[PDB]
Design an enzyme around this catalytic site. Sequence first.
Site, short mmCIF file in Angstrom:
data_model
loop_
_atom_site.label_atom_id
_atom_site.label_comp_id
_atom_site.label_asym_id
_atom_site.label_seq_id
_atom_site.Cartn_x
_atom_site.Cartn_y
_atom_site.Cartn_z
N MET A 28 107.09 78.52 86.61
CA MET A 28 108.16 77.51 86.49
C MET A 28 109.24 77.28 87.58
O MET A 28 109.61 78.01 88.37
CB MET A 28 108.80 77.41 85.24
N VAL A 29 109.61 76.06 87.72
CA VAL A 29 110.86 75.68 88.36
C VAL A 29 112.19 75.46 87.32
O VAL A 29 112.04 74.74 86.37
CB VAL A 29 110.59 74.30 89.13
N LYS A 75 111.60 77.98 92.16
CA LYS A 75 110.41 78.13 91.73
C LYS A 75 109.99 79.52 91.62
O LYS A 75 110.00 80.37 92.75
CB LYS A 75 109.53 77.16 92.89
N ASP A 95 97.84 67.03 99.81
CA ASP A 95 97.87 66.83 98.51
C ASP A 95 99.14 65.83 98.36
O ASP A 95 99.84 66.22 97.50
CB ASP A 95 98.24 68.00 97.59
N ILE A 121 113.44 72.87 84.46
CA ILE A 121 113.45 71.55 85.32
C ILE A 121 111.95 71.09 85.53
O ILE A 121 111.75 70.11 86.07
CB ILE A 121 114.22 71.39 86.16
N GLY A 122 110.89 71.90 85.78
CA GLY A 122 109.52 71.58 86.01
C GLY A 122 108.57 72.69 86.30
O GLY A 122 108.78 73.89 85.85
N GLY A 182 105.69 74.42 89.12
CA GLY A 182 104.90 74.70 90.33
C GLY A 182 103.60 75.20 89.91
O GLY A 182 102.98 75.33 89.07
#
Length: 340
Positions: free
Chosen positions: A28-29, A44, A139, A21-22, A24
């Site tokens: 990976m997430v 994560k 950030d 899904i994404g 970090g």
Amino acid sequence: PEMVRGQVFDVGPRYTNLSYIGEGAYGMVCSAYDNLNKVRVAIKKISPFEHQTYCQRTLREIKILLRFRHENIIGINDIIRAPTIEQMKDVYIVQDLMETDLYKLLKTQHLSNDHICYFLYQILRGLKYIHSANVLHRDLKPSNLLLNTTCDLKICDFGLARVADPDHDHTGFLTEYVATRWYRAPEIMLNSKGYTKSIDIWSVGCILAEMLSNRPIFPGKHYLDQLNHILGILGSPSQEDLNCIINLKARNYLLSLPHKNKVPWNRLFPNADSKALDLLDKMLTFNPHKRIEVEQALAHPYLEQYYDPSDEPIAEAPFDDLPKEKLKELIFEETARFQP
Ligand SMILES: *[C@H]1CC(=O)[C@@H](O)[C@@H](O)C/C=C/c2cc(OC)cc(O)c2C(=O)O[C@@H](C)C1
């Protein structure tokens, strides 16, 4: 273990049925099914232990998030790692599964003014809590703002956060900086270490502008170019604002530039709500001492539909040279509460 894209993703048996899904900072997430709570979650993977700065970032995020509890901050639900330091090579952070993030949304979706207002309200509500703990996120940017299916917003990634330290904020001109370039306040390039709360308000102003047009307002291509972009819109700083910059190299750089006029916000954003642009102007103020603070921003007329200080909670209390080995030890110890 279950494997994802050639890599171990060792979170079972509680968490199963993994999907990418994404990304970090250090891994990976994935989404996963939580067999206990009977819901899908985000996980994560973090592999920090080779590098000292990585372990620093990991430890500081875990320490902050284990203390913070706020509706607009995505918390830590569980942390997975091996039972012994010797066996611990990765750490997994389990968090609420959100639907999207504002970076993804802005790539393809026009936001209604009502969405812009509600998103901005939630960003500032979460930021009020962070700042009330004497912490700076440092950030803030669209990819760190997660949204669920009903557009509730949560702030992600405290790996760059610091305790505010305004008395030690001054530095020289062109001092190196770590946080994301397009959302950096002008003073970062001039005389600031980013150790005061005004750094985050600048980033939120950049996010608001980006919600209004789906384009980053100051997309600089390198360090000093970022300042070119900011001054191209704000125009030349006033004498008073220059006089506030005592550092000669920074001041003389600004004095060396040709005069630049301000670009009016309503020319840049001709469809925007006029109250939104008034708040934008106060967040994107060049002089950080004159820049609006989070509690003032919440009280701004643009947010009147939502503003309610009694429902905008604050933290119950304020919040190097360490070799990675002590830091791995500290990460192990900080994560012990999630073991049997
Ligand atoms: C949030 C901070 C990040 O790591 C940041 O890079 C983020 O943009 C990556 C996105 C992670 C993500 C993605 C989806 O997609 C549906 C859903 C969720 O919940 C998350 C998420 O929770 O990210 C957390 C783990 C990191």
